[PDB]
Subunit: 336 residues, 5 copies
């Protein structure tokens, strides 16, 4: 009984040219694309790339594959894929894309009586995501994903998303788990580009990323905040204890310097100032300013001791207030 | 005499279509899966992936391979594997799976008279293991391993473990050796998933991991514990030695700060607090608090020396008791 | 109707030898090359290599492919590419070049009635860019890209850019985005080389790179500048405070030493002095010189206190002026 | 004249089934294995793997290859290897094995009149070497290398070393050069294993490794030894110099702490104590104990100065003696 | 007209056995090898390997390829290479060699009427270069490159360099550019080796490398030299300033300790002392010795102040002289 299916396959392959698209010189081929993101890979700020794994699916029409039989569907595998025509889809921004092979090549091929074809493929894309780290770490990123035909212009092959946007792109709940980002949502789009070879249709999908704060708070912000508090303790000490107050100022200044170097080692080498850098610089001024205050006080502690005492007492109140006020402005500005 | 076997192989291949599963349109194919873990690979917390090497085996039925001969078994190699039908099994969570080739492709194919087939394969799977580092390092992890068909729905191919759970999955004694984890045990499971293409059967296996403590004790906990003890020595010193007591407080505070930075460099960049972080913070307060005590004492050592002496004497007893009490609560809470 | 195209393809392949170039022993083949840079990859100073992704296109003439039909163009794919003759172009300086495969091999093949052929290919080139870091970081680099034939001498195959230089090489606006470089412009060139096998034609394209400053200012220059200012504070302190002034000098000298080590860790291991190194050395002298001044002052503070006071007062003015003057000369020299 | 050899090859291939082993269902095939280690690769303690390059050779018997001709030997290449039957040998513990291809596949195939076959292959094996770092760095390791058949049980194929053990395994003098290990010698062995598929024969070869000390002496031991000596200098100083003696104790304690962290960064993350760790801990006690002695002395220098002087004088002698005695016990225990 | 060439190719392939070398059982094949180094890759001391890219060329004789035609040369490509016999050359010391593919396999095949064949190939070799770092960094290295036949003994195939040594090996001027080495020159050689399979001919080429100093001077030597000078400043200070002189000695000793650790991190883990290590040790003694001098002086400053002053004055002169004298001996010894 199974032999009937074998005859059908041979008939379709008879007089079949895999090098010619269906409806050549007669109409325009239409392709429907749907995507499912199995898991969203890590985002590397240093390399400006993000990995992703998807089940890419493409649907089109082919009159040459019409067949008649008891079954309306013919599940198959990659064996027959190489014997027919498939679109030459590729990713413009994909630096390096590799497929999955074991245990068996992850591909499917389904054919119906009307000729409709469903071809699906599993891929891993190491695309590139340009970013503007001006409000880092309070930054929102829009990592795109562009793909389209390579050799078939817009006058022969057209890519259109199937059904609505939500059905076109699906993201698994467990996949959207990044250590330092939130997957707020997804969007889709289309456009045309004109080149020497002709016009092409481009399908674009964007993923909205919102960085989650909390790692940098425990790593960079808190050490800077506590370092400033340490310096202010020198004010409460007596003036005559020159050595004691000197240690506080010198050690704190060096501590701030090394934090800036270590903090930016992980951050990408960007030739502009970030929000974190401004925060570090302000904290650097406080510790440095406190050291200057001690030097000025110790330089006039003999001629006019009266003014020195007033300055030292005043500093115990002025400096904490300014630091507290600055934090409210800084956090409010970037968090609202 | 050997020529008899050659004729048998040709007969089976005659009229054989590798693109059609056995019993198509007549019944539902059943596949029995058994696994053996040669060695459990390292677990990378930063990349949330774990490597594993297994001898994957699949058994099914094929009536087209029936044969009659003196021998009930026909040991073979990968040469005949490509000439017949095999399931398109794949791992849903496998980021990158590669097979082993040298010296000869590690595959076997055995056929019996009844048509039963035993196909085995050697694989290395770089799967992903999501984790919740809320009780780190006292954390228990459940790294899964999911696999199933790609193109054949649940109505055509069904995966069922053979015999009991213990026989289905076997782990070598030498393989279960990880530098920073314990392989407490294994479990298996099954479930169905409905998608656009149809329903599929999913076979799930979980490995229980219990982190072994002792590396972090020698790396993070002890330096923090000894640092606190160092600070308390300042209390036993005389008040007039302002410079001496200052060095203890300043150096210890900086030492704690760098330990936090270095400790989390190896730990994954997670935007939430761990148990280790709370322990570090508490130890940071003690050293910082001791420095504040000295400043307060030195600020009133002239007007009311009587109260200063009482505070210094009391601090020698209060602080050690609190630190000792805290450790009992902390360790007891997470170890019981 | 489509069957007409199938017959045409078979006719061209009849009596076609892919191992023989067109017009063998009759004339000289001419090839026109055009390039489009999709994205300019990162530049690794340590490895002296730069990555790049391009759409390489080659045009030539083949009389054997003449055909007559309703359509003047025959869009195709990589399937027919292997069945005809293509040039053996290669990159002389390309350390490791790999192509892109998924989803379908990124190649196109177009044929016209006259025999003109348009073959395009997508490549990623990890070429090598020698550099002279004598004015680092104020350095301008000229990273080339050389390619040509491997087996066909200049007497058989000649490479010539099509149209003008601007049309020959095109760089996408978004692609020319490097974290630490500016793509000032592009240039092209040609030349011949004589070897044992014979003369060959070499096509050379150069990319002008101008390093963008600002990362090193926040990383190396500022810490050195602030460190010098810290040392000068010791002058304003009193001579009798021997311990206080000692701490400033000792700590600052060590701080400068570690900055030099850390700064050059990222920089390539080059056995010659850079502009940054000279700046560090000068700053090292100031902090070291200040320490020497204190030692000299403290060594004569008993016999002739009168001269010691004059030296200390003078140092408060001389040193800042010299440091300010040096910066103007240094920055002006390399920035103009 | 050469045409005679061509006819011989065709005759052997006639009626040859590469899927059936020689003497099937008649006897048991016997295979002789010999190995030559071109170079022993680096040993990675962190990854518990060792690389090795060998010229694997296998000899067996095949009656179907009998031939008659003037020459008793037929040197050949990999071209004929794929056309005959070869054993499916594989390495059980080989995580990832890759062969060498350029310039030409490194394989040989020699056939004699009697049917004896000599098949050799070049391989690189990234095997795994479990270790017990309890006596680190004075540890001796036994890295094995296991290989055997995959599909052919012990009842069909048997592996036996040829000639004696010394001839079976050969190691080049230049190859046995490791930066931090000594190749004391080699050993071989055999055993059987019973599994579901049946019994198999396992050939095991062990390499004895003796770690060479001297890198850790210059890296970890000496800094700890010199640090202890530095602390003892504080004893010779006067009691009234509270600040001076404080610096020695505080700085040394911190120095020991960082050495422990840095030392174990290269060492694998093992959750148990090593010999080096105990040595560090003992040295940590000395520096810490010296600081405690100063605090105790300074705490009674007023009420009973007489006892303080005796303690300080005694400490100058007791501490050096204990440190010297400890080293003799420690080194003698692990070196003998 | 071109059809004549097509007929010639078919005639040569007729009755051609690619598995049999020319002149089998009649004479000894002779192969001429010439090399051109496009670029000399980086040398990794840690991994004891060096990368290199070459255009390997081999010339031999084949009577079966004789042809008659108007053209004395037949330029071709890799298409015909697989259809004839080529030597199985390989590199004995090549850990991992890979070829270049894009755009087209970099291979050429030229045939003359007499049968002479010119086969060339482009390769990248990651060979191993053992080194003896006893005089590091003033060390001269001899990195070899060995290659020869795999299956053809010395009685069948012999490798001989063509023309003189200079013509045999050619190095491009731009290629011989290493960041930390000088390519002084090249040499060639030959030898025979006897093994179980028989005698073989080995072709050896050595590259002379002379390390260029200047990176270590700016990285390791200068910080050590300046650190010693810093310690000597303590001598010029007054004895009563116990705290001041203590800081100089303690900080400098720790600074030297960390330089040794950091310096050897990049250096390979070798279990023996280098020249740099001895220089560091000597500098360590000076700073340590100066600290001992202060302790001895402060220990007798009460009983016999007269002798203390003489020691302090003398130390200001003795120590600088010894350090200067040592440098002359050290540099002269290794630089001459
Ligand atoms: C992600 C959007 C990228 C857009 C806008 O920035 N780039 C362009 O504007 C553009 C792209 C290609 C091009 O042609 C290069 C070429 C091709 C060729 C091949 C296949 C395809 C599909 N397109 C072109 N064949 O030869 C040559 C030479 N010219 C301009
Ligand atoms: C590890 C459990 C993962 C579960 C639950 O989280 N994911 C889903 O719920 C799910 C999976 C696939 C899917 O379809 C995508 C698809 C397929 C296709 C191909 C092969 C297979 C076997 N399944 C689907 N072909 O085209 C498209 C488009 N939709 C939803
Ligand atoms: C980027 C410019 C590089 C220039 C200038 O520095 N190099 C040379 O001057 C040069 C290059 C090759 C050569 O021949 C080596 C050779 C070849 C062979 C193969 C294919 C081609 C295309 N050329 C040569 N076949 O065998 C052997 C031996 N000799 C000198
Ligand atoms: C290095 C020594 C390792 C020893 C002792 O620790 N391991 C075992 O005891 C062991 C090994 C395999 C096994 O079977 C798994 C299997 C196989 C299969 C395939 C090929 C071969 C050659 N053996 C088994 N085919 O399907 C399944 C399922 N069971 C137990
Ligand atoms: C770079 C110089 C290396 C020299 C000197 O140190 N080594 C030796 O002395 C030596 C090399 C091979 C050998 O044989 C191993 C072997 C081979 C085989 C295959 C192909 C070739 C060309 N040679 C041998 N086939 O099976 C087996 C077993 N024995 C000793
Ligand atoms: C792209 O081209 C198609 C041609 O049919 C056209 O319908 C569509 O509107 C174009 N899109 C844009 C954004 O211009
Ligand atoms: C999955 O589907 C099969 C269909 O036969 C059914 O027997 C089984 O109970 C289902 N499993 C679950 C968990 O629903
Ligand atoms: C290279 O050779 C060609 C041969 O036609 C010649 O026309 C051209 O001028 C040569 N180029 C140079 C730079 O010599
Ligand atoms: C392994 O099996 C073979 C079967 O012939 C037997 O001769 C041999 O003694 C066995 N080895 C061991 C260690 O039991
Ligand atoms: C190597 O063998 C050949 C055999 O012809 C011989 O001529 C040559 O002298 C030998 N070389 C050495 C170094 O012995």
């Amino acid at each position: 009984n199974i032999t009937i299916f074998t005859r059908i396959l041979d008939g379709l392959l008879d007089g079949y040219d895999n090098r010619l698209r269906p409806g050549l010189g007669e109409r325009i081929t239409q392709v429907r694309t749907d995507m499912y993101v199995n898991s969203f890979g890590p985002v590397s700020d240093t390399e400006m790339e993000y990995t992703i794994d998807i089940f890419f699916a493409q649907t089109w029409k082919d009159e040459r594959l019409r067949f008649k039989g008891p079954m309306q569907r013919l599940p198959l595998n990659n064996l027959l894929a190489s014997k027919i025509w498939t679109p030459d889809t590729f990713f413009h921004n994909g630096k390096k894309s590799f497929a999955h092979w074991m245990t068996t090549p992850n591909r499917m091929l389904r054919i119906w009586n009307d000729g409709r074809v469903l071809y699906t493929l599993r891929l891993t894309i190491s695309a590139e995501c340009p970013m503007d780290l001006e409000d880092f770490p309070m930054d929102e990123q829009n990592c795109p994903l562009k793909f389209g035909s390579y050799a078939y212009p817009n006058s022969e092959v057209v890519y259109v998303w199937t059904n609505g946007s939500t059905k076109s792109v699906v993201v698994a709940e467990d996949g959207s788990r990044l250590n330092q980002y939130h997957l707020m949502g997804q969007t889709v789009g289309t456009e045309n580009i004109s080149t020497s070879t002709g016009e092409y249709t481009i399908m674009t999908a964007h993923f909205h990323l919102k960085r989650k704060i909390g790692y940098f708070v425990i790593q960079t912000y808190l050490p800077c905040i506590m370092t400033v508090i340490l310096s202010q303790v020198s004010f409460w000490l007596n003036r005559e204890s020159v050595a004691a107050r000197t240690v506080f100022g010198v050690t704190t200044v060096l501590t701030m310097t090394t934090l800036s170097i270590s903090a930016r080692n992980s951050l990408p080498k960007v030739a502009y100032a970030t929000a974190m850098d401004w925060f570090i610089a302000v904290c650097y001024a406080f510790v440095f300013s406190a050291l200057l205050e001690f030097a000025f006080v110790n330089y006039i502690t003999k001629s006019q001791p009266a003014r020195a005492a007033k300055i030292d007492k005043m500093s115990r109140i002025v400096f904490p207030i300014l630091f507290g006020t600055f934090n409210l402005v800084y956090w409010a500005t970037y968090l609202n």
